Amino acid sequence: TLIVTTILEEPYVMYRKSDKPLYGNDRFEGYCLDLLKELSNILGFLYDVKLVPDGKYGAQNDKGEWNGMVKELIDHRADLAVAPLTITYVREKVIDFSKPFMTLGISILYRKGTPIDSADDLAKQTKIEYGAVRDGSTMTFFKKSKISTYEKMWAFMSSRQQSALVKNSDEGIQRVLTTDYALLMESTSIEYVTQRNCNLTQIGGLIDSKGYGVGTPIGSPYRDKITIAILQLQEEGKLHMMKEKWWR
């Protein structure tokens, strides 16, 4: 029944690996898929998982137009957006979000053993390239930040745009591995990476504080119900278990 838009991002949404042929929703696994299964049991609904066609989370272009999963919800092309989608002020003007099912903050993914300790250290220099995922909430944060240092940084990554910004997190992580590059990535995603490559580390603390929520078109009856469901899973300690299962 319900159409759920999502995006491939480890360990939230991934293609399940099997020796036998997988069809439909079975092709996907991960934190967000366990959550979606839970939500459909609690609210009792069927669903079809579809990746967002342009592979973007969603940003508003210079002419006011949106893309990514946000656009899909806006154009009623999807009922739910269940993915590590950041709840932001700008997005709340065009779609509704459930209450957060996970919290995080923008931080820095970089290698270990350098004198770089914060965004400032990155900002006041130029040898180390740094950037974020194109059309994601992190890129938008820097693009709209009125704080000098972040404003300085947006200037840097937007000039070297075609280069500083990456298509997705996997490409950004690979850029951190094979280049002198620091990735502006969200904290729980960084936790997952550094947890698997002891050469990588989080630089500084969180630049901001926020959360991930299930997106729905504006005025959807499902939003409050999903919030109630998230609150239940939280209450019975399943959100913790799910986090531990995937981040291990």
Ligand SMILES: N[C@@H](CCC(=O)O)C(=O)O
């Ligand atoms: N979670 C972000 C994407 C990743 C990022 O921009 O750091 C979003 O909802 O757009």
